[PDB]
């Protein structure tokens, strides 16, 4: 049915936010924030005032969404008044930010109607020459701005806030960060040149904000399909009933995640896997696919990985756990776990399980290590940055030069958790006690 196809495609467009700019959905709890952002852009692109402001909010809290919506709104009516420079703190370094600014300056100025030629000294000198009938507003969007407010030296932030302060070129800088105390990151002169305009992004405060956001996400306000009115009636019947499955899942998200992108990531394959309109209405009334999605998202955690283990793997894991519980530091190796394992096999067989030899338990031990049940003792693991990882890659650790049966390990799951999630009918259940 092409009508259901059009309705499904429009629902997916509304969920991914890829609507045209005048049809774009702004949640009510995001409104007073975005109008505030709408002021600052309109004071910079139109009235040529210089602004510096940092947006502070968590990940997926609509900083980039609201900024992109503001730039799309200004681009439809004032497209010759401003240029856009985008920097990201993960991707740009302190050297490559200069080349990024200069390259974006030339590809934006040739789009309106070289700066980036030469060495980095000449490139920075040319940027300072350009930046330090009307003027074109330069709009900087600086995502992950906390990475450039380092303790060492904040050169780029100094020069950019000086461009806001003392330059005659109208410059608008929007920083974005998750750091709540971003103002303490700034150096004294950088903080003095900054305007201390910090906009804290709004949070969901109560349940009907989330229900209204879901209603805005799923109501179709344009006549794209014959099914639009019936889908709107079905959705309003689900959201108005406080005992419906949709309101129950929204409430659960409100008390656990409190995240609308988390809910959207589950709602999208509910709509997309529907084959006709009746299946979509049944799926939104029952929300059973949300339960299947929630089960799949938890399938590879510690609880779900345990249920994939064979009986020998479970026996070795139980033996290692009780050895680790008996240890003062929680440390164990292959030999102690094998000794505990053979003590349990002869204690069970005295009351017939094949007793696997030590040369065959090595494969089980390597599988248990690979499945993140044991960790090497005092191991750092994944390093925070590439420099520490490179430093660690040029050193040979003491665990990798001793034989494998003497390597010290620690459990990711303790014996009490093992007693909690292993069923009573399992025949190794009695050894999860001590």
């Amino acid at each position: 049915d092409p009508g259901f196809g059009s309705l499904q495609r429009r629902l997916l467009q509304q969920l991914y936010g890829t609507l045209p700019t005048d049809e774009k959905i702004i949640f009510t709890y995001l409104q007073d924030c975005q109008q505030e952002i709408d002021r600052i852009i309109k004071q910079s692109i139109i009235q040529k005032e210089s602004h510096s402001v940092i947006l502070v909010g968590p990940r997926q809290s609509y900083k980039t969404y609201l900024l992109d919506y503001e730039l799309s709104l200004l681009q439809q009516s004032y497209k010759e008044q401003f240029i856009t420079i985008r920097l990201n703190g993960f991707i740009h370094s302190e050297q490559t930010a200069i080349n990024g600014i200069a390259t974006q300056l030339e590809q934006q100025l040739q789009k309106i109607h070289t700066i980036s030629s030469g060495s980095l000294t000449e490139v920075f000198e040319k940027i300072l020459l350009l930046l330090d009938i009307t003027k074109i507003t330069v709009v900087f969007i600086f995502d992950e701005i906390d990475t450039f407010a380092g303790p060492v030296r904040q050169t780029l932030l100094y020069n950019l806030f000086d461009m806001v302060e003392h330059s005659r070129v109208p410059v608008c800088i929007f920083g974005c960060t998750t750091k709540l105390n971003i103002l303490e990151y700034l150096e004294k002169r950088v903080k003095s040149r900054f305007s201390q305009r910090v906009i804290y992004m709004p949070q969901i405060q109560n349940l009907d904000d989330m229900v209204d956001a879901v209603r805005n996400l799923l109501t179709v306000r344009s006549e794209i399909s014959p099914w639009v009115s019936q889908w709107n009636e079905t959705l309003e019947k689900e959201l108005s009933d406080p005992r419906s499955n949709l309101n129950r899942h929204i409430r659960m998200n409100f008390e656990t995640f409190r995240s609308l992108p988390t809910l959207k990531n589950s709602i999208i394959p509910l709509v997309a896997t529907s084959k006709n309109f009746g299946s979509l209405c049944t799926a939104i009334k029952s929300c059973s696919f949300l339960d299947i999605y929630n089960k799949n998202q938890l399938s590879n955690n510690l609880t779900g990985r345990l249920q994939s283990l064979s009986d020998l793997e479970l026996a070795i894991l139980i033996s290692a756990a009780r050895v680790a519980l008996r240890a003062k530091d929680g440390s164990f190796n292959f030999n102690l776990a094998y000794a505990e394992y053979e003590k349990m096999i002869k204690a069970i067989n005295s009351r017939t399980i094949k007793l696997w030899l030590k040369k065959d338990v090595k494969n089980v031990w390597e599988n248990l290590v690979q499945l993140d049940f044991f960790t090497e003792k005092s191991a750092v693991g994944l390093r925070d940055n590439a420099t520490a990882a490179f430093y660690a890659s040029n050193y040979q650790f003491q665990g990798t030069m001793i034989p494998f049966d003497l390597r010290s390990y620690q459990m990711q799951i303790i014996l009490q958790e093992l007693r909690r999630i292993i069923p009573k009918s399992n025949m190794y259940y009695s050894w999860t006690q001590l």
Partner: protein, 117 residues
Amino acid sequence: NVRMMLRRSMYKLYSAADAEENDVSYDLSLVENFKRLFGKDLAMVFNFKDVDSINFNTLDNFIILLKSAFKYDHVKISLIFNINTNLSNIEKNLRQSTIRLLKRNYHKLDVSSNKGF
């Protein structure tokens, strides 16, 4: 580490293939693109000198990395391990899946200083 192992091996591969008959990245994709860049099939023989001195975690990861070249249809890989202690010592220093991979086609060749006097 494994990165230096692959970089030295790929530099040796590109140097020999250029010396027989444009720069490249010294990783395994040169093994992937060898037939396009040189027009010939590839036979690599890896000679690991003094295996009883190498870090076996690094060697295990390098062998697992070299396993990815099996799907390229024009590459065949031979490994030579110069063992000075015993085969059983290097058996317990490697992962069991690596042993099962090496067991598919392997031979032993004993040449000491007085093999058979």
